[PDB]
Amino acid sequence: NIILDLLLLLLTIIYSYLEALVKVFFPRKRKSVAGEIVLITGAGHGIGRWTAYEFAKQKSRLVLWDINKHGVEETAAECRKLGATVHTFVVDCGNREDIYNSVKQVKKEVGDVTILVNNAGTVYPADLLSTKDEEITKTFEINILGHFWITKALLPSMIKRNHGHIVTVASVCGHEGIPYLIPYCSSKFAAVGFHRALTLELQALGITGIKTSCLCPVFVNTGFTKNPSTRPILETDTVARSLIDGILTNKKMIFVPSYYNIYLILDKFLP
Amino acid sequence: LLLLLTIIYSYLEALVKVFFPRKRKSVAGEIVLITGAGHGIGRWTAYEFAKQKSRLVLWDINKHGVEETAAECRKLGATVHTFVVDCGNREDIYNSVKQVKKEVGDVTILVNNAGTVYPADLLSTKDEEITKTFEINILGHFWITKALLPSMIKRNHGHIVTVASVCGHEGIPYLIPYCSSKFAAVGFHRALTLELQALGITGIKTSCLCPVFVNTGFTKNPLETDTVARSLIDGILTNKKMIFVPSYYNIYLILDKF
Ligand SMILES: NC(=O)c1ccc[n+]([C@@H]2O[C@H](COP(=O)([O-])OP(=O)(O)OC[C@H]3O[C@@H](n4cnc5c(N)ncnc54)[C@H](O)[C@@H]3O)[C@@H](O)[C@H]2O)c1
Ligand SMILES: NC(=O)c1ccc[n+]([C@@H]2O[C@H](COP(=O)([O-])OP(=O)(O)OC[C@H]3O[C@@H](n4cnc5c(N)ncnc54)[C@H](O)[C@@H]3O)[C@@H](O)[C@H]2O)c1
Ligand SMILES: O=C(NC[C@]1(O)CC[C@H](COc2ccccc2F)CC1)c1ccc(O)c(F)c1
Ligand SMILES: O=C(NC[C@]1(O)CC[C@H](COc2ccccc2F)CC1)c1ccc(O)c(F)c1
């Protein structure tokens, strides 16, 4: 217990310092996203909202979607103060029909989205037998099925121009199971799979201009879930910074904190 | 290079399997519910359970195919009950669980095998088919497990078998909706294992079957059915959590993480 704490803590410093060393010695080049049409779902609060702020500083043209009218317009007001041109829409990102109709409006009002951030998410923590079936369905409808309908609507223009970036906001819950989050983990594993199979298909289809990134943070202080009872302290602006740095550098799998990948590599060796 | 790692891992495993073997439990007299048992993996898994002397509950939307499996199981000496159930339909699942309870009793081993696939690139897929894929390959696992888990918990004895794929571990072009639904099946199994553990439920075991392509006619040809059914039964009896078919496929998965 004292031995395994000091063992993994040393690697939380070893992997982290090794990465910050390679990041200066052999760096990945940063692209520009200025003037790109960025659509962010769940832009009304938390990660989506702070990702919208990063894109506003990057000089992108923003399209913000959310079911919360007040929340998304509040993010847009901050983005406009940052100097960005912003369009907001009230869209249920778990509703296939609402998504398609809103994509026609985005096309007519702004133009063709070049960067899609599938951020909107839901969760109803409970043990399997305490979950409501309506909750399981909502979780899948928003966390994964919505990613299909939005990507399918926006991908044809990106393919035609051979230029785009599909950003999947998953979780470390898409890599490991967590108790009381069975429907949620399952939907997040589905998001990781969509990103992986999408990357491989574009490659197989000879589509070189469309990039893919998958954001996998640990618990974040956004109010999305109730703070763990007794238990890595992660703030919203840190996650939004990690995501923007990942997108600009065309990084496929963005773990937040980046060192979290050692636990994932370790699990693939355990008895 | 990789052809050698395949022979090395395979022979290392067959060596440990005789030197330090896992003990095999009995499933004789257990009430085993197998979904999509009207053909392929589910059918040949039903045959393995019939030889194991289990009581069988076979579900499928293919009535003729499921009664054909049942006839073979009965020849093998097993008692078998068949039901025509859409394992992607929540209402049909719940009503059928009422009928299973009234006619057979409490299921102790659940095999979530029923599955669907519509190969096509993302932009060629039909939205109705993406929904069907999720409804059957994962959402159905929630409704069936939720219905059958309460009796297993009460008795602290059960086994939840998730039939996923290597597609639940790696992405495949032309199988985006399918891979996504299979990743969801792997995640359900992983989070379910960890939750039972956290809740102090020691008697309920979990296994996840992840085969590569199998010659069942599930998809057009780019591993035989009886081989997969044998691997699954050997995995269940030995309480193995992750059953890759072929078992050596795990080296490619360990390699991808580097
Ligand atoms: N918070 C964490 O601990 C954590 C960790 C890892 C990953 N994530 C993921 O990050 C994403 C954003 O979560 P967050 O922590 O910023 O949460 P949040 O509660 O701060 O905000 C999520 C936003 O999504 C919106 N939304 C919900 N349902 C929607 C729908 N049907 N249509 C449109 N918008 C909808 C909400 O209105 C809200 O503004 C989610 O996909 C979540 O699963 C969160
Ligand atoms: N065949 C492969 O290459 C392969 C590889 C890995 C995993 N798998 C998985 O193995 C499982 C079984 O596939 P298979 O290869 O034996 O296919 P199969 O075609 O031989 O049979 C699948 C069975 O599922 C039944 N089914 C389909 N929809 C159903 C529904 N709504 N309700 C009830 N039953 C339903 C079908 O009637 C059929 O009998 C699936 O979960 C599949 O995804 C298959
Ligand atoms: O950890 C996240 N939230 C915190 C919770 O809200 C509260 C704690 C429970 C886990 O509780 C236990 C775990 C193991 C044993 C016993 C527990 F009780 C998960 C939900 C969380 C939620 C979304 C994410 O996307 C994410 F990465 C992390
Ligand atoms: O491999 C399985 N089926 C085979 C196909 O039926 C036919 C080939 C395509 C993949 O094609 C390509 C992949 C990469 C590059 C170029 C391709 F053309 C998948 C579907 C298969 C199907 C279910 C499973 O569960 C599984 F594990 C495997």
- Write out A107-149 in H/E/C secondary structure: HHHCCCCCEEEECCCCCCCCCHHHCCHHHHHHHHHHHHHHHHH
Task: Determine whether the interchain pair B257/A269 forms a contact, defined as Cβ–Cβ distance below 8 Å.
Answer: no
**Is A204 in the B-facing interface, judged by CB distances under 8 Å?**
yes
Residue pairs spanning A and B at CB distance below 8 A: 154
CATH at B75: 3.40.50.720
Q: Which two tokens stand for residue A129?
A: 């037998």
Distance CA B34, CA B45 (A): 8
Distance CA B211, CA B221 (A): 15
Q: How far is the CA of A118 from the centre of ligand 1 (A)?
A: 10
What is the domain extent for residue A25? 1-268
Q: How far is the CA of B245 from the centre of ligand 1 (A)?
A: 37
State how far the alpha carbon of A184 is from the alpha carbons of A140, A144, A173, B63, in Å: 8, 10, 8, 34
- Whether B58 contacts B80, CB under 8 Å: yes
- Whether B125 contacts B176, CB under 8 Å: yes
Q: Which value, in Å, is the radius of gyration of the alpha carbons in chain B?
A: 18
Under DSSP, the state recorded for B38 is T
SS3 per-residue string spanning B65-77: HHHHHHHHHHHCC
Q: Which DSSP string do the residues of A205-233 spell out, in sequence order?
A: TT--SEEEEEEEE---SSSSSPPPS----
Per DSSP bridges, beta strands A61-66 and A164-169 are: unpaired
Instruction: Give the sheet arrangement for strand A164-169, strand by strand.
Output: A86-90, A61-66, A37-41, A115-118, A164-169, A210-217, A253-256
Question: Considering every ligand atom, which ligand is closest to the CA of A143?
Answer: 1
- Whether B121 contacts B173, CB under 8 Å: yes
Backbone discontinuities in chain B, residue before each (C to N > 2.5 A): 222
Distance CA A125, CA B87 (A): 25
**Is A187 in the B-facing interface, judged by CB distances under 8 Å?**
yes
Under DSSP, the state recorded for B204 is E
Task: Determine whether the interchain pair A152/B194 forms a contact, defined as Cβ–Cβ distance below 8 Å.
Answer: no
Nearest C-alpha of chain B: how many angstroms from A56? Answer: 30
To the nearest 10°, the Cα dihedral for B69, B73, B78, B80? 10
Among A99, A93, A46, A97, smallest CA distance to A67 is for A93
Query: For B137, phi and psi rounded to 5 degrees?
Result: -70, -15
Among A152, A195, A158, smallest CA distance to A174 is for A195
Residues in chain B: 258
Per DSSP bridges, beta strands A115-118 and A86-90 are: unpaired
- Whether A90 contacts A72, CB under 8 Å: yes
Distance CA A140, CA A188 (A): 9
Method: X-ray
Query: For B88, phi and psi rounded to 5 degrees?
Result: -115, 0
| Burial per residue of B92-118, b for 16 or more beta-carbon CB atoms within 10 angstroms, e otherwise | bbeebbeebeeebeebbbbbbbbbbbb
- Helix boundaries (H) for chain B: 2-19, 40-51, 63-75, 90-103, 127-134, 140-155, 176-198, 225-237, 250-256
Q: How far is the CA of A36 from the centre of ligand 1 (A)?
A: 23
Among B150, B147, B38, smallest CA distance to B90 is for B147
Distance CA A83, CA A85 (A): 7
Q: Which of B170, B183, B190 sits opposite A190 (nearest CB)?
A: B183
Domains held by chain A: number: 1
Q: Which of A137, A177, A190 sits opposite B180 (nearest CB)?
A: A190
Distance CA B124, CA B91 (A): 30
Q: Which two tokens stand for residue B196?
A: 């039972």
What letter represents residue A244's amino acid?
Answer: I
Reported for A15-18, long-range contacts at CB under 8 A and 24+ positions apart, including other chains, are A15/A258, A15/A259, A15/A261, A15/A262, A16/A257, A16/A258, A16/A259
Catalytic option among B178, B248, B249, B252: B178
Distance CA A194, CA A51 (A): 21
Distance CA B238, CA B146 (A): 24
Using a CB-CB cut-off of 8 Å, the residues of chain A touching B175 are: 197
Question: CB-side exposure of B136: number of CA atoms within 13 Å?
Answer: 21
DSSP, collapsed to helix, strand or coil, labels residue B35 as: strand
**Is A185 in the B-facing interface, judged by CB distances under 8 Å?**
yes
**Planar angle of CA B140, B146, B152, nearest 5 degrees:** 130
Dmax (CA) of chain B: 56
User: Cis link prior to A179 (omega < 30° from 0)?
Assistant: no
Q: Where are the beta strands (DSSP E) in chain A?
A: 37-41, 61-66, 86-90, 115-118, 164-169, 210-217, 253-256
Instruction: Write the burial class of residue B221 (CB in 10 Å: 0-12 exposed, 13-18 middle, 19+ buried).
Output: exposed
Q: Which DSSP string do the residues of B145-199 spell out, in sequence order?
A: HHHHHHHHHHHT-EEEEEE--GGGTS--TT-HHHHHHHHHHHHHHHHHHHHHHHT
**Resolution of the entry in angstroms:** 1.9
Query: For A79, phi and psi rounded to 5 degrees?
Result: -65, -40
Distance CA B61, CA B35 (A): 9
Query: For B35, phi and psi rounded to 5 degrees?
Result: -90, 155
Binding-site residues from annotation of B for NAD(+): 41, 60, 86-87, 113-114, 178, 182, 214, 216
Distance CA A164, CA A184 (A): 28
Query: For A98, phi and psi rounded to 5 degrees?
Result: -65, -40
Using a CB-CB cut-off of 8 Å, the residues of chain B touching A116 are: none
The region that residue A154 occupies, defined by phi over 0 for left and psi between -120 and 50 for alpha, beta otherwise, is: alpha
Task: Determine whether the interchain pair A152/B193 forms a contact, defined as Cβ–Cβ distance below 8 Å.
Answer: no
Instruction: Write the burial class of residue A68 (CB in 10 Å: 0-12 exposed, 13-18 middle, 19+ buried).
Output: middle
Distance CA B114, CA A120 (A): 30
Give, rounded to a whole angstrom, the gap between the first and last alpha carbons of chain A.
Answer: 18
Q: Which of A134, A180, A194, A260 to mutate to test the interface with B (most CBs of B within 10 A)?
A: A194
The tokens 């054909």 sit on which residue? B68
- Whether A254 contacts A215, CB under 8 Å: yes
- Whether A190 contacts A140, CB under 8 Å: yes
Q: Which two tokens stand for residue A144?
A: 């994964």
